[PDB]
C-alpha cells in the first residue's frame, strides 16, 4: 500500500492485544508510546525530542502489529503528544519513502 | 527513486541562499529550522513535541529547492536541534510512504 502525506499517516497498531492510534515517523528513530502497561523488566533510556530530554521506559522484543503487519521490537514508553512508530520498528515492516 | 529507512533519511535543501541538511520526517506536520534570517513578515508560534514545546517565527510563501524540486511552502525557524522537513513540502514534492 502507498500513504500520502497530505493528513498526519495515522495508523492502527496492536499491543498488548488492543487497538490504538499511531503516527508513521520517519523522523523518529525509535519508538515511543503514551503510558501503558508492557510485560516483563524495563531499562532506562534518554530521548531528545524538539523540546528536549525526556525519561523512557525501554522494553525489549515487544510484540506489535503495525497496519497488520507483525513486527518484534524495542517500544519505548514515556510523555509522548501521540503514538509515533520510529525507523526501528518502519524497517520491520518494509516501509521506505518514495518520489 | 527509493530512499531506505535503516538510517536517519538526511537531503542538503537550498533556501535562502544557504545549504542545509535536514530531515525527511513524516511525523513533523511542518517544516522547522535552526535560526535563520528570512526575508517578509513572521508570526510567533509555539510547537510541541517530545521533551515540550519551542517558540519559533512563522514564514509562509518560502521557496526551497530539495531533491531537484523547486517547493514553496511554511517555514518555522527556531531553536530546533535538528534541520525538519514537514509534510507541508513532503507532499509538494510528491514523496509518499510505501510499505
Ligand atoms: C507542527 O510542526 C511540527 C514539526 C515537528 C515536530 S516534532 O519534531 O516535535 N515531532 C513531531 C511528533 C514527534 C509529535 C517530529 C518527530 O519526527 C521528531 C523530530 C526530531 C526532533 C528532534 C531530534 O533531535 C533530537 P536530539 O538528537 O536529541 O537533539 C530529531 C528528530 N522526532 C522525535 O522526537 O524522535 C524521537 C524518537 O526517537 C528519537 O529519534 C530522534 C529524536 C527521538 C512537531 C511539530
Redesign the interface.
Given at each position: 500500500?502507498?500513504?500520502?502525506?497530505?493528513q498526519?499517516?495515522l495508523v492502527t497498531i496492536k499491543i498488548g492485544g488492543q487497538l490504538k492510534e499511531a503516527?508513521?515517523?520517519?523522523?523518529?528513530?525509535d519508538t515511543?508510546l503514551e503510558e501503558m502497561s508492557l510485560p516483563g523488566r524495563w531499562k532506562p533510556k534518554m530521548?531528545?525530542?524538539?523540546?528536549?530530554?525526556?525519561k523512557v521506559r525501554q522494553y525489549d522484543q515487544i510484540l506489535i502489529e503495525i497496519?497488520g503487519?507483525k513486527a518484534i521490537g524495542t517500544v519505548l514508553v514515556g510523555?509522548?503528544?501521540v503514538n509515533?512508530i520510529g525507523?526501528n520498528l518502519?524497517?520491520q515492516?518494509?516501509?521506505?519513502?518514495?518520489?
Amino acid at each position: 500500500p502507498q500513504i500520502t502525506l497530505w493528513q498526519r499517516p495515522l495508523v492502527t497498531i496492536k499491543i498488548g492485544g488492543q487497538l490504538k492510534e499511531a503516527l508513521l515517523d520517519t523522523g523518529a528513530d525509535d519508538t515511543v508510546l503514551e503510558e501503558m502497561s508492557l510485560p516483563g523488566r524495563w531499562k532506562p533510556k534518554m530521548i531528545g525530542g524538539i523540546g528536549g530530554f525526556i525519561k523512557v521506559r525501554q522494553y525489549d522484543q515487544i510484540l506489535i502489529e503495525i497496519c497488520g503487519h507483525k513486527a518484534i521490537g524495542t517500544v519505548l514508553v514515556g510523555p509522548t503528544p501521540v503514538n509515533i512508530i520510529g525507523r526501528n520498528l518502519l524497517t520491520q515492516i518494509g516501509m521506505t519513502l518514495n518520489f
